[PDB]
Write a protein that binds this ligand. Structure first.
Ligand SMILES: *[C@@H]1O[C@H](CO)[C@@H](O[C@@H]2O[C@H](CO)[C@@H](O)[C@H](O)[C@H]2NC(C)=O)[C@H](O)[C@H]1NC(C)=O
Ligand SMILES: *[C@@H]1O[C@H](CO)[C@@H](O[C@@H]2O[C@H](CO)[C@@H](O)[C@H](O)[C@H]2NC(C)=O)[C@H](O)[C@H]1NC(C)=O
Ligand SMILES: *[C@@H]1O[C@H](CO)[C@@H](O[C@@H]2O[C@H](CO)[C@@H](O)[C@H](O)[C@H]2NC(C)=O)[C@H](O)[C@H]1NC(C)=O
Ligand SMILES: *[C@@H]1O[C@H](CO)[C@@H](O)[C@H](O)[C@H]1NC(C)=O
Ligand SMILES: *[C@@H]1O[C@H](CO)[C@@H](O)[C@H](O)[C@H]1NC(C)=O
Ligand SMILES: *[C@@H]1O[C@H](CO)[C@@H](O)[C@H](O)[C@H]1NC(C)=O
Ligand SMILES: *[C@@H]1O[C@H](CO)[C@@H](O)[C@H](O)[C@H]1NC(C)=O
Ligand SMILES: *[C@@H]1O[C@H](CO)[C@@H](O)[C@H](O)[C@H]1NC(C)=O
Ligand SMILES: *[C@@H]1O[C@H](CO)[C@@H](O)[C@H](O)[C@H]1NC(C)=O
Ligand SMILES: *[C@@H]1O[C@H](CO)[C@@H](O)[C@H](O)[C@H]1NC(C)=O
Ligand SMILES: *[C@@H]1O[C@H](CO)[C@@H](O)[C@H](O)[C@H]1NC(C)=O
Ligand SMILES: *[C@@H]1O[C@H](CO)[C@@H](O)[C@H](O)[C@H]1NC(C)=O
Lengths: 122, 123, 108, 122, 122, 123, 108, 123, 108
């Protein structure tokens, strides 16, 4: 395949190319070229910070404790993974992204506190 | 004045269920871990369950591990215990108590400071 | 369970000792052994915690110690008002959390 | 609350707002503006590198194996968490920061080596 | 020792100075100085991204499931760790670096998928 | 038409070994988890082993845990089972089946949809 | 194992129930209990899965339910063609994966 | 010449304690893992404890797990063993030995290369 | 423990075999089986390690092998100087670390 080769593939199939996409995020006139590189770095770091905040700091794929709400475009399970591409999915739930992210942050802080308490039990 | 006041209880058939609750005041409810302690008629004291102050961590004595639920509502200042699949061996006074584990920022205790008077449960 | 054997007694004004024997790892490794005063039909009162501490509201009569795998409660000069069952309990390593001892009766 | 809303709160209370603060670290004339952004990125990375070095790479809260020395401003436990703000704490132990950091680095390298040995036991 | 003090030491001995080296990666005319800093940041991030991709996101030392091939300059085990420096080792296997990296990426994606399946077993 | 067809089997001495295999078609082999199920002569059904669709995760019933290997080749559409250190207690018909665990993206089943006819193994 | 006791019977056209009793955590906690129709010398056919579902190819005669720690298969009006052994099985919490019940014979 | 020389030992009452030590030379002390091996009077050999070369990882046979401590001082080239809560069953010669686990960079051995003569401990 | 049964013997110049039988997973899965020569009052000497290796200082007389769950030590032509107890030992999967066999006596 190669970079974005999986863009037209189903969401399930495309889950096998996350490595490929991840590597291509990093790999006066001149000042505007320099500005663009700096902004690209800041963007990269923001995505990494969210993964860190959500408790998914070193994974391309991870699980969380936030249940999927049926209100968030319930489109079955197999229909999403086998008969839809990621480009379509990103529109199906575009109005829920901020809700989901907020939930992911909250159901991390709750976990860190529980872990901290357990480490204090002699 | 710190008070823990239990309610609920009564006689239930073996194989049945019931729920106990405890209201509390005189302290910030949300600042303390709580537990239920069993006083069987002639045994005196058995630990049953422990819940932390945020209501997220629960621990049980093995004998009730698959049957009892300990829960909290910090807006109501209420501690509660749901007991399922009751046995005759569970006949006891069940006491509401504050203590046990703590927040890890605040001098963990591992003992009980306050006791209610307890609900009587017969099975 | 921890063992606090029956029974302990003495005349008013005499000191008495109430024992509590554990096993190996429970009161041997954890300095979280408490003592309670249990009245016949009332909720128990905390007397001793950790090893040697007592909460406000508890008088100088009650003190205690631990050595090896055995703990004890000392009453420095017994009152008739101390006719209660005594219970010891201790932290159990996050496995069973707390172990209560069989209690023992004090007669004055 | 919001950003720095917890600054006047006790250290304990303020531990619940770490997420809020973390997100606001990332979120010729023009060249000096560009320079400032680059330096902000380098600063961010230095803090992340220390967390990585200390074995606390993806957590807002984590525990270590370094004991607290009583010489490091022993102020009890409950007094620190309930009757002090983070701004005050940062002054109470400002002369011990480098000592603590050095200890945190050492009591990581010792842990990585022990883990490496265990993974070689058939 | 200090920065690069271990460069002439054996590979084994030098494994104890990884912390030292890691910290020194971060710690019109003016525009070229700014450009150099930006590029240094991008380089740093690329190394961190690989460690993330390989499943070694927060460690200076980590293990993988890729076996060492004898074709990759088999030089024994004790000879490499006790009688060779890292500078020499980097030449002994310079033509296998891309092969090894590709294997490390593949034997991660396989692991993430297996973990994902296990988390779905009730 | 989905078909699972077993081969191999036969009588082997206790302490010996043998290998079974199952060819399959009518479905994408690589899309389904598979298992072997034992039918002892008078017991009917015992679960023996489960393998996921990518051939990376295997699970066994404790009784064969240190003796049997379950494996797959998705280019051949073949499931196989290697049985070592055989016991008389392993006499059974061994069935090839599709089902059990799934991919976690596709409605995990926890049941078997298709069965072959089974190989007969005597020890 | 799960228990499906011997034996179940009835005249053609009558309904019958085949039981399957588990323990506590197995069919009590997991709604993955299946039923199979086992012919005398043929591979078994799936009838019921989850609790109440049936695959295409299975007629309306077969339905079922679960309550407490006990599951059952119901045949709405028995045919002579149903003289088969019935087996129940269920998911076992990733510890033993699947538990088959001892089966039971249906006579028409 | 590699030598391991034990000291300490003697007769101790059951319920008592003692400490053994071993000095060593002829090799870099810090390069090798070490262990203590028990020779009961008529049993010959029992493994007791293993410590790695940096003195950070210790392993014990279950029978002494809650009673014995194995420790090292690499500046002194000394291995030591503290035995608490002694039992009559611990009467044995205790040998200082080099070997067992290794650094993971250096050909792990899983055998003992050198032995001292051992201290005699009677309980 | 591993078993090296009593007893082994032969005349000077004859070869002898000393066995060491394990169980399943210990010497079956780990090729870390060593043999030691134990003199009556002296510390033991290492003869064999891994399966077939011997340290410098050990002569050609001592060799060995492993098959299945059983290991053995072979002495190619016995000397009177070999009257020692022999012990086998092996790695035990990081659970018990090392298992020694009951040893066995060699008489020339
Ligand atoms: C799924 O999203 C819906 C829509 O926001 C949530 O329903 C709301 O829940 C709040 C909670 O107090 C109610 O006040 C709203 O009135 C609910 N909205 C509707 C339309 O009923 C629902 O709770 C979410 N479910 C989960 C599991 O998060
Ligand atoms: C706490 O800090 C003090 C002060 O630095 C440490 O005490 C010093 O320890 C070194 C160790 O060799 C001694 O040489 C110094 O003389 C000690 N200083 C004083 C004033 O006594 C102390 O060890 C630290 N404690 C912990 C637990 O780290
Ligand atoms: C070690 O590297 C060698 C060299 O690339 C690998 O050998 C090749 O394996 C492929 C696999 O199909 C064969 O087609 C080549 O012909 C092999 N090359 C040679 C020279 O034989 C070898 O498999 C690698 N080993 C490991 C464990 O990865
Ligand atoms: C494109 O659609 C066709 C329709 O059958 C499908 O076979 C093909 O695999 C699809 N390609 C990708 C990249 O998914
Ligand atoms: C929706 O989910 C149900 C669950 O069984 C499934 O049967 C149905 O086919 C799904 N619909 C689609 C469009 O996949
Ligand atoms: C988001 O809201 C707009 C508002 O009109 C709506 O048209 C759009 O379809 C919504 N998107 C989703 C995913 O519901
Ligand atoms: C400020 O101090 C008052 C004093 O009672 C306290 O109640 C209040 O919560 C404090 N505010 C914050 C943000 O801590
Ligand atoms: C200091 O710690 C002790 C430990 O019990 C506590 O009793 C005391 O009140 C603490 N002091 C302050 C100021 O909190
Ligand atoms: C740090 O050292 C200076 C030197 O005078 C001292 O005044 C200051 O109080 C010290 N800070 C701490 C936290 O002790
Ligand atoms: C340099 O080589 C000598 C040769 O003996 C060795 O002793 C010394 O430690 C080496 N230095 C380093 C830094 O390895
Ligand atoms: C190569 O490895 C073998 C394995 O035992 C070892 O004996 C030999 O000395 C090693 N060679 C070198 C140069 O270290
Ligand atoms: C890499 O390939 C070149 C091609 O000539 C060769 O000279 C060099 O030695 C090779 N390096 C290694 C590590 O084999």
């Amino acid at each position: 395949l190669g970079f974005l080769g999986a863009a037209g593939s189903t969401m399930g199939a495309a889950s096998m190319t996350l490595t490929v996409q991840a590597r291509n995020l990093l790999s006066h006139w001149g000042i505007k070229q320099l500005q663009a590189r700096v902004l690209a770095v800041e963007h990269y770091l923001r995505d990494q910070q969210l993964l860190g905040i959500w408790g998914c700091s070193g994974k391309l794929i991870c699980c969380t404790n936030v249940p999927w709400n049926s209100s968030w475009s319930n489109r079955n399970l197999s229909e999403i993974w086998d008969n839809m591409t990621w480009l379509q999915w990103d529109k199906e739930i575009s109005n829920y992204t901020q809700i989901i992210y907020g939930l992911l942050e909250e159901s991390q802080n709750q976990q860190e506190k529980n872990e901290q308490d357990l480490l204090a039990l002699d | 004045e710190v008070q823990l006041v239990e309610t609920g209880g009564g006689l239930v058939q073996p194989g049945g269920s019931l729920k106990l609750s405890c209201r509390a005041s005189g302290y910030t409810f949300s600042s303390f871990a709580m537990s239920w302690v069993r006083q069987a008629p002639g045994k005196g004291l058995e630990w049953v369950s422990l819940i932390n102050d945020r209501g997220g961590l629960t621990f049980y004595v093995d004998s009730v591990k698959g049957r009892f639920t300990i829960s909290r509502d910090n807006s109501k200042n209420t501690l509660s215990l749901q007991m399922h699949s009751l046995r005759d061996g569970d006949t006891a006074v069940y006491y509401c108590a504050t203590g046990g584990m703590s927040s890890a920022l605040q001098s963990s205790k591992y003992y009980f400071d306050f006791w209610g008077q307890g609900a009587l449960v017969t099975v | 369970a921890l063992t606090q054997p029956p029974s302990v007694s003495g005349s008013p004004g005499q000191s008495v000792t109430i024992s509590c024997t554990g096993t190996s790892s429970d009161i041997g490794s954890y300095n979280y052994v408490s003592w309670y005063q249990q009245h016949p039909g009332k909720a128990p009162k905390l007397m001793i915690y950790d090893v040697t501490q007592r909460p406000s509201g508890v008088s100088d009569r009650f003190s205690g110690s631990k050595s090896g795998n055995t703990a004890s409660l000392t009453i420095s000069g017994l009152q008739a008002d101390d006719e209660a069952d005594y219970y010891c309990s201790a932290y159990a390593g996050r496995q069973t959390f707390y172990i209560f001892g069989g209690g023992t009766r004090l007669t004055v």
